Symmetry: C2
Subunit: 96 residues, 2 copies
Amino acid sequence: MAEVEETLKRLQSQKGVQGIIVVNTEGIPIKSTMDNPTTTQYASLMHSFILKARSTVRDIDPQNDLTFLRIRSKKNEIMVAPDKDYFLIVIQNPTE
Amino acid sequence: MAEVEETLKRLQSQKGVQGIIVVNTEGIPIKSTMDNPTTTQYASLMHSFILKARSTVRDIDPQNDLTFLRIRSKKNEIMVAPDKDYFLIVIQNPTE
């Protein structure tokens, strides 16, 4: 549990940092490196989308499940790994 | 256009083949290596989901867009690249 939170900080990567938002089972981000308005505009928008994967994923068969996800984007990389009782959107990049 | 269709065949990869489904702007798969019932059960289910990315993606800002996507799954890899007037779900795997 505590080690898992430490992993989130490792998501900082190095500097690409497009914005980091940690969200719990509540939907509301328990933490974020964003100013504030970006945090909810993305958190609320991404939160709804992330549940679609687990929902859509389970709809076909319980045999499989969502272990990780990453949407490509011209402006930045989109990736949100849903863990145990917490999940987060990691907006960052390789300065590419 | 014709070269793009040839690329789809290259998606065969080597043998992982979990199922390959080509879908056009119609929603209905213009082609597939699946028996038949799997093709529509996944195509119709995946079709709705794929549009959510472009929809969700554009909802935040037109500056970015979905160039490619890949959902992780315990049973197989999920990936569907939406191209110009056609897009397809490539279900395959590295026999891992």
